[PDB]
Design a protein around this ligand. Sequence first.
Ligand SMILES: O=C(O)c1cccc(N2C(=O)C(O)=C(C(=O)c3ccc(Cl)s3)[C@@H]2c2cc(Cl)c3c(c2)OCO3)c1
Length: 123
Amino acid sequence: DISAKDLRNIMYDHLPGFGTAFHQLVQVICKLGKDSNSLDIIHAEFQASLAEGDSPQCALIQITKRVPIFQDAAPPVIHIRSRGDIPRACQKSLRPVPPSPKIDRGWVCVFQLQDGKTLGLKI
Ligand SMILES: O=C(O)c1cccc(N2C(=O)C(O)=C(C(=O)c3ccc(Cl)s3)[C@@H]2c2cc(Cl)c3c(c2)OCO3)c1
């Protein structure tokens, strides 16, 4: 069966740039997908969206809206040392964390920094 790493690579193969907010959204989709044994339906939705003519970016957002593990779900917390550990291409997408961030509203993840700071990654 397809693994989280396989699916990450497949999705990466469709994205422009490196270390962008969409690359992180791929990471989150694969990790949450792995943890809920849903990598197959996620891959199926991804390919179906591309097949309909959607951009790969739109296909990733549609996964957050169509695959039920993401619906009304909070973004995962990812512990990191400092803001510098986040890829350069994501930096301008980092925001203060709103009261009830939701993945299907574009809040990809929340970075929990060592010194207590928290930053949400927004699309
Ligand atoms: O361990 C796994 O099975 C697995 C599956 C998919 C993705 C990942 N993740 C990584 O290996 C990894 O480095 C991940 C990552 O996105 C980042 C780490 C540091 C910065 Cl900055 S971003 C990623 C991962 C994604 C999510 Cl949603 C996580 C996570 C790691 O830990 C808790 O929530 C792990």
